[PDB]
């Protein structure tokens, strides 16, 4: 299964977040998120999520887990066992992925110390970056960065992307309030 980062980031510092939260809410990067992480090619497949224990936290008590879709909670403290169709906990990603059998595409969607770690791991072999603009950058309270090595990292046309998504709609600028943001393709050199 392709391992993958999908992380929405305000150049040129890529912040993520403030105060534990995210700072921003982008109501059509959101369904990009919804369609991307869920779309399979192959048939009677899923895609799996993984994400951190705080983001798990964070992420509404209602609507968890992520349906169509496998979540993966990485926690030290939790053995490496499955609670139910859904929800999976697990030490590391190395064991998620012995653990479990039929999955197409593995997605890493949080937090910060998530990104920092998996970012250096020879698994992922590709990030679907969302480059947010904003006019005044210094005017968003922030401190929490993302502390990616991107001169390693090559920038991939939007065609390499087009293939990525499948048939899933993807507007260049787009303009929500002040911010602007665009979906880009990153592969290893
Ligand atoms: N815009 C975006 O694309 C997104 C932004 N964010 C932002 O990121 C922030 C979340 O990051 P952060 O606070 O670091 O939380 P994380 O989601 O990274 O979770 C951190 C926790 O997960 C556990 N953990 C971390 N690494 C490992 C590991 N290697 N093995 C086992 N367990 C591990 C630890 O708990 P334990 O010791 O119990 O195991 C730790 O306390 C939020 O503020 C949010 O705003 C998050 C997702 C998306
Ligand atoms: C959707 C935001 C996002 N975008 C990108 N490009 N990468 C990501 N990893 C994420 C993310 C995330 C975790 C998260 C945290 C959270 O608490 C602040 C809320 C959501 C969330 C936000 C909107 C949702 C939803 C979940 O279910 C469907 O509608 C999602």
Known sequence: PNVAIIVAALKPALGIGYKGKMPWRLRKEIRYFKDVTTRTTKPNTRNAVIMGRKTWESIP????????????????????????????????????????????????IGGAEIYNELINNSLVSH???????????????????????????????????????????????????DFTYNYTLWTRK
């Open 127 to 177: 990030l679907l970056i969302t480059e947010i603009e904003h006019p005044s950058p210094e005017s968003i309270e922030m401190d929490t960065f993302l502390k990616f090595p991107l001169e390693s990292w090559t920038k991939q046309p939007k065609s390499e992307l087009q293939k990525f998504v499948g048939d899933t709609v993807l507007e260049d600028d787009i303009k929500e309030g």
């Open 61 to 108: 008590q209602k609507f968890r887990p992520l349906p169509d879709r496998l979540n993966i909670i990485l926690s030290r403290s939790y053995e490496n066992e499955i609670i139910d169709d859904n929800i999976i906990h697990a030490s590391s990603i190395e064991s998620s992925l012995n653990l479990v059998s039929d999955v197409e595409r593995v997605f890493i």
